[PDB]
Amino acid sequence: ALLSFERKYRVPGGTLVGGNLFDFWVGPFYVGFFGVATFFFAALGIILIAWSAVLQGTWNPQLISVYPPALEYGLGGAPLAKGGLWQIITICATGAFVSWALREVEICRKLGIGYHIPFAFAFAILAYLTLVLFRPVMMGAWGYAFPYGIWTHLDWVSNTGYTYGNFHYNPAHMIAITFFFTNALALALHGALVLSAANPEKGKEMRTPDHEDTFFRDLVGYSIGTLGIHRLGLLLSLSAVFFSALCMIITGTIWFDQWVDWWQWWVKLPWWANIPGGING
């Protein structure tokens, strides 16, 4: 029921709202006020998705889809069978994510640690809201937001990207991809380095962080450090998501053309705009 060290930490306090009414644990989970909120929102959303599966006439989990209302419904409600179930699932998911972050804040306060984790999750929630709320609001239709299906929100990504040509040419998209790839690379390097220090070759003494720094200075001539690597991982992930949200917020609202054409401003700079040869000239 508890870890071998857990008991000395399960003290009252740290609650944002309430204090005794919802200050306890169910199994391993801490149940706050936001715990109750999150559980209700999640259960309502999941069973609504099951209901929409019943309405759609398919019991394939991969084929289940909850489309938003068509474009002619604007920013208004829709019949449950047509577009309203998506809106209820959307408000449920938004509430679930926000209450999950708040429950994390309560857990942080009880444990006496920093609030970095809910902050990063807030970045993720903001990207989600950009995709479901902010961008469709600026484009005046819930139909622009993605459907809630496993293989049908991919169709949303495909259609939305191809509306603007090759979506690779969105510059903020390029930056966000660079951050994502760099973050995966850094995660692999960090896991590998820690495991290699903690698991030396064969019956060898466990390595110190000096060995980690020496390994990476030998390899690439720099070592960001034990604290620096965790700072870097957090910042890479958050910057990736930030530039993802930035790239989507400007698409369809500030930019409407093919994204490749955006690069013409570099090739048309007057000093070299009309020099023959190369590719564009």
Partner: protein
């Protein structure tokens, strides 16, 4: 209003750290480079020393030849015009030979041979760097986790440039050397094979890239939140569990219902990261060689309405 531990607020510098001389030939190791206060605001300020052995110099010179070959081809495409070179830098491309040459090496330099030369240089550089990571791990007596994690990315790279072109029967299938060029190659690869979104292994690879972002955010945030207990010194927490490790474990235990340890979270990390390129290489290998229309395959396997 509170210190978030994102940037160090006071930098301290001592004598240059030469590192641990487990089995390292101190002759190959260079001298300690400069100290960067700009880098010191975020991590270590010290640059170097860097080890330069047989594989190091082999990989460095081979990669220099690859980079220089691509650059000289780009200069040729610019008509030796520096203004044109800067204007069209992202538009230049060293393209693989046309499909009618198949896998043959008898393609002209302007039409694929120079691509083969640069590809050989890149192949040598990357494999020598892999051996270099393995040997640097071995010299310090550490485990080889970095080498195998690198081997996963090497496998995706090899599938993209070497293995799938051979299976498909032509060098034209491989990726051109260019900034916008390889983006065009990626988009065209998706279009030719019918919406690579419906490749299951592309989907898993994206699951694991998203999961790597999620997990590194979680882990970095967790370690920063318990850095007030010396939590970033993870090896000592593995060897002698402090209150940082317990508080991190209990945070995720009370949030998710399960947690990791200071050592096993890094197993989660390394596997989440390597699965990206492992699954991606499997998917790219399947594309064209087994499935040429992933949307129709999807429809036949659920995943899409008939």
């Amino acid at each position: 209003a509170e210190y978030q531990n994102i940037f160090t607020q006071v930098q301290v510098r001592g004598p240059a750290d030469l590192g641990m001389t487990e089995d390292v030939n101190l002759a190959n190791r260079s001298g300690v480079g400069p100290f960067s206060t700009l880098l010191g605001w975020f991590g270590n300020a010290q640059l170097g020393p860097i080890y330069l052995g047989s594989l190091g110099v082999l990989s460095l010179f081979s990669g220099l030849m690859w980079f220089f070959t691509i650059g000289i081809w780009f200069w040729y495409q610019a008509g030796w015009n520096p203004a044109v070179f800067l204007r069209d830098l992202f538009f230049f491309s060293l393209e693989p030979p046309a499909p009618e040459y198949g896998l043959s090496f008898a393609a002209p330099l302007k039409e694929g041979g120079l691509w083969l030369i640069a590809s050989f240089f890149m192949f040598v550089a990357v494999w020598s760097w892999w051996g270099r990571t393995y040997l640097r791990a071995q010299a310090l007596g550490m485990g080889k986790h970095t080498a195998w994690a690198f081997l996963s990315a090497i496998w995706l790279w090899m599938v993209l440039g070497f293995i799938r072109p051979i299976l498909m029967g032509s060098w034209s299938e491989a990726v051109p050397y260019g900034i916008f060029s390889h983006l065009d190659w990626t988009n065209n690869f998706s279009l030719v094979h019918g919406n690579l979104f419906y490749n299951p292994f592309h989907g898993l690879s994206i699951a694991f890239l998203y999961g790597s972002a999620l997990l590194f955010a979680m882990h970095g945030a967790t370690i920063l939140a318990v850095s007030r207990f010396g939590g970033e010194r993870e090896l000592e927490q593995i060897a002698d569990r402090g209150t940082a490790a317990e508080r991190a474990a209990l945070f995720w235990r009370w949030t998710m219902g399960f947690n990791a340890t200071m050592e096993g979270i890094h197993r989660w990390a390394i596997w989440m990261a390597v699965l990206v390129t492992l699954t991606g290489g499997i998917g790219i290998l399947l594309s064209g060689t087994v499935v040429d229309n992933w949307y129709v395959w999807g429809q036949n396997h659920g995943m899409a309405p008939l």
